[PDB]
């Protein structure tokens, strides 16, 4: 009868659904909207805060903030409202009747999952729950048991290698570069054309232009010379005001920041070198199967042409004897949630839920013991 609740709870955008389906029930941006003006028509829908889709359409008069920043929940009083809207409005199911599968990014601070579990039990009174790693679920959903997952969502990027279902914690690599860092770099590079987006309401328009026009290039210098040679890459986009902006060269300069974080004033290496070092950190015997099941996942990896670029870079980094396969599922935007659902539907997993009575024995710290 009862079924577990699978909530991705990823940074930037929130996904939720019931355990045992092939699609997340409800996806809504993790945005908390608050009015920054003072209403003059009282009684016509005055609410102290708008969450989710109502905080997207009304963004013209709202200040919008993200509860999760770089995978870390920065405002718990806002995460509580996001969770309440997820439970009681989008799914319209009480929490006291279903288990809840939260997901967390690797190498996240200690208090994060602790407060997650604490809020899950002390406020919503959930029967059972779990805190699974966001990356490992993608390999489950991919239909494999060996390989390295490259999960680049909105707040955190991370490459995690898994063999035979057991993860290798010593070779987990994390990178604070993410999709919101590309949005910010686009808000900077767009000024060279004569455009100014600085408002949180306009960051959403910048994000929409990004995931509609920008695309990774296969040879960045050759595409730069192509753009400088003849204007044939420019595209027209229409803002909600009706202006017709025109971004040309700026198409691939934004996604390229993934492979060269020096564009963002960061010291670390690109995503390709990140995956390469994460793989070469794995045991030598298993590497032969790793290079064959390199899987992309999450939102930000859905760039046009990212597959060929990743393959070229990793095969130029790895030796020629090795077989490089960048397997890119055509639905990798929800792979984390699909894998979470698959894992939650297992009878073997029906014993891995941290129960309430167990929570009462050792306090929230229990989450550090059960979850891997």
């Amino acid at each position: 009868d009862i079924a577990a609740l699978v909530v991705d709870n990823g940074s930037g955008m929130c996904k939720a659904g019931f355990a045992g389906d092939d699609a997340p029930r409800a996806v809504f941006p993790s945005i908390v909207g608050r009015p920054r003006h003072q209403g003059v028509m009282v009684g016509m829908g005055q609410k102290d805060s708008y969450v989710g889709d109502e905080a997207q359409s009304k963004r013209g008069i709202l200040t919008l903030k993200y509860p999760i920043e770089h995978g870390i929940v920065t405002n718990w009083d806002d995460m509580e409202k996001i969770w309440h809207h997820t439970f009681y409005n989008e799914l319209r199911v009480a929490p006291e009747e279903h288990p809840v599968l939260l997901t967390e990014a690797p190498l996240n601070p200690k208090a994060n999952r602790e407060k997650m579990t604490q809020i899950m039990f002390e406020t919503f009174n959930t029967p059972a729950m779990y805190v699974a790693i966001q990356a490992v679920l993608s390999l489950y959903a991919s239909g494999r048991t060996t390989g390295i997952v490259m999960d680049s969502g909105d707040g955190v990027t991370h490459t995690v290698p898994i063999y035979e279902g057991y993860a290798l914690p010593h070779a987990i690599l994390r990178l604070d570069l993410a999709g919101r860092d590309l949005t910010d770099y686009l808000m900077k590079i767009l000024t060279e054309r004569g455009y100014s987006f600085t408002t949180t309401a306009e960051r959403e328009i910048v994000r929409d232009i990004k995931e509609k026009l920008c695309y990774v290039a296969l040879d960045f210098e050759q595409e730069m010379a192509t753009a400088a040679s003849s204007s044939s890459l420019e595209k027209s986009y229409e803002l909600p005001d009706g202006q017709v902006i025109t971004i040309g060269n700026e198409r691939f300069r934004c996604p390229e920041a993934l492979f060269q974080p020096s564009f963002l004033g960061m010291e670390s290496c690109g995503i390709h070198e990140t995956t390469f070092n994460s793989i070469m950190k794995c045991d030598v015997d298993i590497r032969k199967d790793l290079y064959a099941n390199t899987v992309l996942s999450g939102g930000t990896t859905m760039y046009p042409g990212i597959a060929d670029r990743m393959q070229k870079e990793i095969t130029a980094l790895a030796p020629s004897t090795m077989k490089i396969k960048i397997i890119a599922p055509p639905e990798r935007k929800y792979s984390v949630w699909i894998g979470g659902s698959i894992l939650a539907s297992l009878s073997t997993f029906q014993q891995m839920w941290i129960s309430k009575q167990e929570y009462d024995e050792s306090g929230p710290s229990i989450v550090h013991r059960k979850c891997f």
Partner: peptide, 7 residues
Amino acid sequence: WXAXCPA
């Protein structure tokens, strides 16, 4: 400016 703000 051209988009955003006047200038």
